[PDB]
Amino acid sequence: NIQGRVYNFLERPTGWKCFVYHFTVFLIVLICLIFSVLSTIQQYNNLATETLFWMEIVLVVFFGAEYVVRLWSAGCRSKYVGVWGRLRFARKPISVIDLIVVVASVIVLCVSAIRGIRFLQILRMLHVDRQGGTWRLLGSVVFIHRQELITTLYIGFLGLIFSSYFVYLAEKDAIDSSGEYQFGSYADALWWGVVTVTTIGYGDKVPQTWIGKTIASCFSVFAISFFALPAGILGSGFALKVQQKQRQKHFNRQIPAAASLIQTAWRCYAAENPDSATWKIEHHRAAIKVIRRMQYFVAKKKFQQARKPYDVRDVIEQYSQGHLNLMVRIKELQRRLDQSL
Amino acid sequence: NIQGRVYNFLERPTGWKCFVYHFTVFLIVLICLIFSVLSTIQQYNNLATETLFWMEIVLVVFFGAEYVVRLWSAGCRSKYVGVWGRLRFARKPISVIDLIVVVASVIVLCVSAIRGIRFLQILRMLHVDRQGGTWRLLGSVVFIHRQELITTLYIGFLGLIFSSYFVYLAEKDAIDSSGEYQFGSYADALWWGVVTVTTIGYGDKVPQTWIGKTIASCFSVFAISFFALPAGILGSGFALKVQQKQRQKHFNRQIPAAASLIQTAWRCYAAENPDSATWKIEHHRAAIKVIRRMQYFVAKKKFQQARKPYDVRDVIEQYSQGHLNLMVRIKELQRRLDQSL
Amino acid sequence: NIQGRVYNFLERPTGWKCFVYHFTVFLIVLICLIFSVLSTIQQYNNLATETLFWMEIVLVVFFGAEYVVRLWSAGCRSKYVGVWGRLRFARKPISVIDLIVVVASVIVLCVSAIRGIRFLQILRMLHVDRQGGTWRLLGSVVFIHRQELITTLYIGFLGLIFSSYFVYLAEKDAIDSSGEYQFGSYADALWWGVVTVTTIGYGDKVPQTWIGKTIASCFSVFAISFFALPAGILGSGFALKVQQKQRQKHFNRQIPAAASLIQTAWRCYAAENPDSATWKIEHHRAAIKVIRRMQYFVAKKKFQQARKPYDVRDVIEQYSQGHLNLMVRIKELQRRLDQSL
Amino acid sequence: NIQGRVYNFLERPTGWKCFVYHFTVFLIVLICLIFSVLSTIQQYNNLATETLFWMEIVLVVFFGAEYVVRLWSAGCRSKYVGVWGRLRFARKPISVIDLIVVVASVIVLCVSAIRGIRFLQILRMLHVDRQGGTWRLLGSVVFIHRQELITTLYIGFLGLIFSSYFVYLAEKDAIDSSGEYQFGSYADALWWGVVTVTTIGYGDKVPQTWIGKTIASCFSVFAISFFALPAGILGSGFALKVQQKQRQKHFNRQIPAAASLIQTAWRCYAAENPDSATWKIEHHRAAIKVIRRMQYFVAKKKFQQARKPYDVRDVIEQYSQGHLNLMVRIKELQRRLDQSL
Amino acid sequence: IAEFKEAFSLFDKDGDGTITTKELGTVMRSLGQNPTEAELQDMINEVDADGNGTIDFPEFLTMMARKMKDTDSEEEIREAFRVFDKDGNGYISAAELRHVMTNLGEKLTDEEVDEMIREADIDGDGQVNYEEFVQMM
Amino acid sequence: IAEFKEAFSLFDKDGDGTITTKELGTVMRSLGQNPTEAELQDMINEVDADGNGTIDFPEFLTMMARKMKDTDSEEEIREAFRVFDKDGNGYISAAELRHVMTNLGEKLTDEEVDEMIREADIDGDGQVNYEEFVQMM
Amino acid sequence: IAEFKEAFSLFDKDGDGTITTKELGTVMRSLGQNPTEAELQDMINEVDADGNGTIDFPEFLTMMARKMKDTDSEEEIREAFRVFDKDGNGYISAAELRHVMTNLGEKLTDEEVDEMIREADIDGDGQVNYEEFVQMM
Amino acid sequence: IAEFKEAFSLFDKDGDGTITTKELGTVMRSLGQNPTEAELQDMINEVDADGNGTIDFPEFLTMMARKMKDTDSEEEIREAFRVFDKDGNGYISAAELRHVMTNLGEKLTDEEVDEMIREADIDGDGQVNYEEFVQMM
Ligand SMILES: [Ca+2]
Ligand SMILES: [Ca+2]
Ligand SMILES: [Ca+2]
Ligand SMILES: [Ca+2]
Ligand SMILES: [Ca+2]
Ligand SMILES: [Ca+2]
Ligand SMILES: [Ca+2]
Ligand SMILES: [Ca+2]
Ligand SMILES: [Ca+2]
Ligand SMILES: [Ca+2]
Ligand SMILES: [Ca+2]
Ligand SMILES: [Ca+2]
């Protein structure tokens, strides 16, 4: 049980002490990054390099200890067991990132100024997001909106290319105020387009001829929205997903469905072997198998609807079931009354 | 069947091999575009022109072969048959674009530097989106939100015009730091407005007099949203359309509705001819026609609701139908009981 | 009927000929505005002034004729009748705008260069949006989201003020590259804030001291969203309103509700006079009035629900009504069966 | 009652006179802030300081009078009573802000130019939002979307850090046009990233080497949306919350639920004491307590659903209840018919 | 004020304090309208302000306090009239008004419809301006 | 125009002005179709344009005015045919068309299906081009 | 802990392990409350934690474990009191509290309401501060 | 392939071509399960692929074609097992597995549950690793 407690304290936290520990390690990483930023300036290079070297070595020792403890504690789960289980646990992207950070830091320390340690701590800053919880939500939403994040990233890109080419044609030969050709080549016009369709507008390149200015005015008001569309799409998707989560079915309403699914699956598995205890409730063999298959399919169909949130489909199907039962009862009452009389 | 297989492999792909082929041709087009961009720079002009000429001629030969193969294979569908069917297939905008690209490339090669070949390959970059799948979604969403994409593009435009005129009046005579009149004419103020209401802000034109700065501050916080509104509207529309697609009726629930619609339409058609086999189930002629018309209208009404996703309207109408049936059964039971007693 | 036809052709168009007429007049106004823009440049001032004078006089004559025709044709509606009806019609904001444009243009022509004619035609550009159809939708949506467009325009404004003051304190005394104090006074810092919290970023004012840059970095990522929030709110509101319009009740489902409402209102009105024909179906006078009041309230309650789109409230109330009716029928059946036996 | 009237007039206004008073005090504060802004400019410093001193002293006297009146009138509510009630009322953040403003203004006046009075009136500008009504909505929406405002502020931040580091590596040694190293240190690159991923784009720092420009182009189109995502998320959340408020249950449908909840809670409380009047409807003591506990839990469960808006859950549970009642009635009818016959 | 007590007393018919649906149905049967249970439930729910399913005396006073001629009711009646009116104008032909009121909703008697037409279409034209008619009520 | 009066008269069977659901059921029973109450209610609701639950003569004229061959109906019939058609093309095999029409929806008789096949698959191929068949109707 | 076993045993009445709705109804009838089937189903669903429609002993222990005096329950009771309270304050007049508890919801007896008033409005004022009353419970 | 014809023939019991709900109920009664009409309707709807309410031979072949051991089914069974499993791990105690299968859902017999435990908890530990058990099926 101690292994499970350690695993729960390190990965998938559920309390305040684990939250405090994770916030502390994240704050230490952030402070190390800030010190690295201050050391990148030549003014503070006198002792920032040495203090960062000491902080980096103590931090990599701490991360190695934490990683070996987590690897030992990963045996709690059924998937990670034995020797191959640890290797499968190390296959996870977060574990790969941690191992790469530790190994690269050790290599850099062995091989006194460090140049890549800034990138190493930038990568280390990713250590906070455990079990991919932050990335999974974005991945799910992008996958849901896959057919609309491509339309906005293909029509927008095509409009960008066409508008940049038109601006380049309009302002190909136009000397700026300082005598430097703004849109000398198509690459410069493409850079200007990537700067304009994203509402950045540095101001290094500005169309000069009135034709280029007119084209930029006519296209900016239209084609800019095709690049801000993914932000709105993902935001509305996040809001709708939160709203649906607000209307989730209670956790106690899927336990019977799961029990039925597991029981039907086991019955179907046991029906394969003729010498089994499942044959308690010769041509009947081909009939019981079909019945068990239909029962398994029904149980699987109900379980999926049990896990899904409440919806109009549930209301209409439940009313259909209730109406069928009521009609059967009315019919049997009428039949009994007619038979008696 | 080979013609249908070729048509499915070229247009409307449904597998991985077709996906690989389309991704490969799109990547080839993108690489050609990148090489054209690098050739537009005078530094790389030595051999980029020649290698692009060779790549362009081989690519146009490949596209001509692909287009003639697609034209031959388009005869699989019923609409495209014979000679006029091929011409009707060539009327599609994507086919028109491909034909224009091929013909223009051939003309340019016949008539060794090529100036318009950059625009030709920019147009060729549109070849990836087959059957207008990318454009159809955007067109449908814009058509749905037609009455709200005009309000934001009319109030926003009017606010832009008024604010630009007010800024021009405020900063008509104001020499900048370099001695150049920023808002010399109304055209310059309009360009500044088109640059500001889109959150671009190049910085070439900035109001100088405090009146112009005050007007720009008071209007930017308000009138900018009227131009970012289309992006939010379209994003929320895309998200809601995805959510509705998540709640679509099963494909097996519309087959009986389609069968009823087709049968009723055929019965109505056959009722026109008195000598037909439909008269198996003289003044009755005027009565059967009305009955068949009502049946056809009902079948058409049900089919449209069958294709539409689940909605509260379906639940309320289905409950009304079930309640009417149940009330009829209760009434007949009561009538039979009273008649017996 | 000719007056009604003229009124429908001018105001609230419903065909293609009226659409063509309105598009033509809007295009004429836009072309006049473009010519005014080109005339504002000193290069084209030679004959643009004269051609714009002629176009303006012919256009104001046309607009006067159209306005007098519309004023004559406004008598079709019941509200606009007689002399006071025309004055009430002229009270509408669009009619006021048209009258102001015509009168101001006449005054300018009487009093040969025209300076305010540019503003007059800018105002004339508003003539296209008839019956306030464009403005009514935005007004309704803003009124619906009134409690959330104030939160974003009050927290955002407060954050802007605080951040601008902090930046001013950080960079109060900091000479720029050109030797000019960027944030000399609080007004300059406020202008910088209004430029930054709106993602404009002209670049005229940029914080120089690292404290100001740090404050701008820490606040820009957070407080910018509080200013782009109204755009997202209004966009999502527009999308949801369109979705609700997609789920509107059929126009034929509110006619009985309207008939019941009007009949109950008339019955309540007639119940006031004792000598009336409504007393066909002395202390009963005080009882019939209460019954008619309750019937009127019920009819008004149903009519409002009839005009509102389909909703879960309608489903639950309709099921409650159906269940009550069914329970009453079951109870009467049971009572009759028990009485017989 | 006069104390309650004063409290309602000052806090939580509900009329027009209170609205006029609050708008007047807000306008006075805004005018004082505008005068402070004009006084920050050295041109107007001659008499603006003196007039602002007089306005500030009269305004702080007025605010002290208003605060003492509000403190006296806060005794109307049950929570704020006696001496400790006033202290608990003063613990509210708005009361703390008002007290801090008054005390700091008095201290500044006692200790003739005032430097911090600008910040004092900036803080005073927060006085308009009473009872935290503006902040509560934003806090609730952020708390609802807590798991999605962190994903966008963690993936966006990580992308910003990585992109800024890559740009710094690409353009570490690149002299600008004026001979000044744009990305001299990592801090400059981070500032450029914070300026670019927010669509600000001042133009002070622009990548020069083509590698940096390519990296900025490839990342700007993607990672910018991760920073505009919170705006869209909060906007869609606000719109959905407004839509849900449009579908709220009537206030008269929760009074019976509240009555049942209070009665069941009081019955459970009284069941603790054996000598009570609740024992009117020895081992039965352990049975009545369980019954009262179940009744209290049911009443609490219904009250929460009564306060929540209409939803599909309400429809399905209400149909289940109605169907169970109808089935019970049908079963009892059948049982009675069978027993009679 | 005192008049409502007499009106409330006769509806109650038992002197308990609540106007049950059965009591309202009995009063209507005494009048001779023969209502339906669903209609009675709808009326009670419209009048009830506490959700208990019965009409209390404060609820009866609240119902009898608010009256017509308000903007929120005049606008509703005008919209209801607009529902029938075609061609977008503010004039309804007398034939359409007479036909609708005798068939749709609760069918009025011929005398009531004739009185309505006389009071509404006071002028000799064949179309009744429903705006002035609503303003009269 | 005058023909619809004769058609409306026989459906009414009582000369009042409204085609009640009972009258429509009686007419169908005279024809010999034996419908269901739900089907009759659906037909009335589809034809009714005032929501009163009965068919009026103007409503009957409106129903008989709009006819087929419109784009909004030809497209609907083409989509209904596409529902059955597999492999994305515009050809439906004769076996599938014959099997579906005799089982799904309202089961057509053998003679009707044979006539439909003969009129649709006029050519000798085993597949009927439903596009030309719809264009024929 | 051991007390709950005795309480669970008497509700079961058959010694199987599940408290069926019929058993709960029998216990209530023995007490003399005469409940409704819908009320029993609602109680079972509120207590049931596995969705099987019957109360298990672990479910009974879970129900008897969580109790009142928690913040999530005190706040709910305070909001329920606020529902009745007008004028936004924290004081409810004794007349309103006495009238509501004897009519709305489940009608309490006169003795229970009198005891509630005495325990709540301990001071001599005519209004009971429901905040202190809730804090007492 | 040919085996399904024999299986389909016995379910039909009349040789028409469609497995009506009555025929399925008759087959189940012959087996001795005594189902409910709602369960039969749910089974038919799950198997039916044309929405006609009856099972056709192509639909029966489609049902018998797709089988278990697929990822979309193994993942579903693993999630169903996770529903019961507490403490987030992949181990379910034998007592919980035995108790749930005999009470919740369709109550298995003691012999079936014992065989399931023996086949699942092959090792001597008191907890059955449901991952390996699902992989076995
Ligand atoms: Ca009574
Ligand atoms: Ca009441
Ligand atoms: Ca008239
Ligand atoms: Ca009739
Ligand atoms: Ca009718
Ligand atoms: Ca053919
Ligand atoms: Ca039992
Ligand atoms: Ca249980
Ligand atoms: Ca008290
Ligand atoms: Ca059969
Ligand atoms: Ca079938
Ligand atoms: Ca094991």
XYZ file of C-alpha atoms in Angstrom, chain C residues 150-289:
140
model
C -20.682 46.357 -18.696
C -18.527 43.949 -16.682
C -16.028 43.667 -19.541
C -16.120 47.441 -20.125
C -15.630 48.200 -16.409
C -13.056 45.622 -15.315
C -11.182 46.191 -18.568
C -11.259 49.967 -18.125
C -10.152 49.713 -14.489
C -7.297 47.384 -15.409
C -6.316 49.770 -18.194
C -6.209 52.713 -15.779
C -4.206 50.849 -13.132
C -1.746 49.377 -15.643
C -1.241 52.736 -17.356
C -0.549 54.402 -14.010
C 1.930 51.673 -13.056
C 3.715 51.976 -16.413
C 3.830 55.758 -15.993
C 5.399 55.347 -12.553
C 7.919 52.821 -13.886
C 8.899 54.865 -16.966
C 8.286 58.434 -15.795
C 11.899 59.563 -16.336
C 13.370 57.540 -19.207
C 14.809 59.227 -22.294
C 14.062 57.333 -25.506
C 16.545 56.705 -28.321
C 15.740 60.055 -29.962
C 15.929 61.992 -26.685
C 12.165 62.519 -26.332
C 10.403 61.512 -23.113
C 7.943 58.783 -24.091
C 5.828 58.839 -20.916
C 6.276 62.501 -20.068
C 2.827 62.891 -18.501
C 0.017 60.588 -17.424
C -1.853 61.423 -20.638
C 0.897 59.812 -22.721
C 0.808 56.686 -20.554
C -2.981 56.537 -20.887
C -2.691 56.816 -24.673
C -0.131 54.000 -24.618
C -2.518 51.908 -22.535
C -5.439 52.525 -24.899
C -3.103 51.522 -27.739
C -1.862 48.344 -26.005
C -4.997 46.882 -24.358
C -6.641 46.953 -27.811
C -3.840 45.006 -29.580
C -3.138 47.973 -31.852
C 0.477 48.703 -30.948
C 1.472 51.611 -33.176
C 4.989 51.679 -31.735
C 5.179 55.424 -31.090
C 5.389 54.774 -27.333
C 7.235 51.696 -26.057
C 8.333 51.186 -22.426
C 12.101 51.457 -22.004
C 13.002 50.746 -18.374
C 12.898 47.037 -17.577
C 10.317 47.662 -14.838
C 7.875 49.158 -17.329
C 8.528 46.354 -19.804
C 7.930 43.756 -17.079
C 4.668 45.428 -16.026
C 3.497 45.639 -19.644
C 4.365 41.974 -20.204
C 2.601 40.839 -17.025
C -0.560 42.848 -17.719
C -0.866 42.537 -21.513
C -1.384 38.769 -21.440
C -4.226 39.177 -18.905
C -5.973 42.541 -19.315
C -6.125 42.391 -23.128
C -8.782 39.661 -22.995
C -11.020 41.948 -20.923
C -11.252 44.247 -23.969
C -11.712 41.550 -26.625
C -14.435 40.004 -24.454
C -17.316 42.125 -25.884
C -16.540 40.870 -29.396
C -16.709 37.235 -28.311
C -19.811 37.826 -26.188
C -21.690 39.494 -29.041
C -20.528 36.881 -31.551
C -21.700 33.984 -29.404
C -24.951 35.839 -28.739
C -25.525 36.289 -32.470
C -24.801 32.604 -33.098
C -27.152 31.480 -30.319
C -29.881 33.816 -31.586
C -29.515 32.327 -35.074
C -29.695 28.822 -33.595
C -32.884 29.733 -31.721
C -34.357 31.230 -34.900
C -33.632 27.864 -36.526
C -35.947 26.313 -33.894
C -38.913 28.676 -34.189
C -42.501 27.506 -33.881
C -44.506 27.340 -37.093
C -46.530 30.446 -37.918
C -49.758 28.408 -38.022
C -49.451 27.322 -34.368
C -50.115 30.795 -32.903
C -53.285 31.788 -34.794
C -55.646 30.002 -32.338
C -53.741 31.540 -29.420
C -54.091 35.026 -30.912
C -57.791 34.423 -31.564
C -58.334 33.286 -27.975
C -56.416 36.289 -26.623
C -58.407 38.789 -28.691
C -61.740 37.125 -27.877
C -61.003 37.034 -24.139
C -59.866 40.670 -24.164
C -63.042 41.731 -25.970
C -65.171 39.693 -23.558
C -63.476 41.381 -20.597
C -64.075 44.779 -22.205
C -67.750 43.996 -22.852
C -68.284 42.674 -19.314
C -67.879 46.257 -18.070
C -71.189 47.314 -19.643
C -74.155 45.445 -18.095
C -76.298 46.098 -21.198
C -74.325 44.032 -23.693
C -74.727 40.877 -25.757
C -71.865 39.166 -23.891
C -74.327 38.138 -21.141
C -75.735 35.169 -23.049
C -73.580 32.254 -21.838
C -77.375 39.837 -9.874
C -74.505 38.484 -7.777
C -73.404 36.432 -10.801
C -72.011 39.657 -12.297
C -69.130 39.652 -9.805
C -68.468 35.981 -10.629
C -68.511 36.167 -14.436
C -66.014 39.046 -14.371
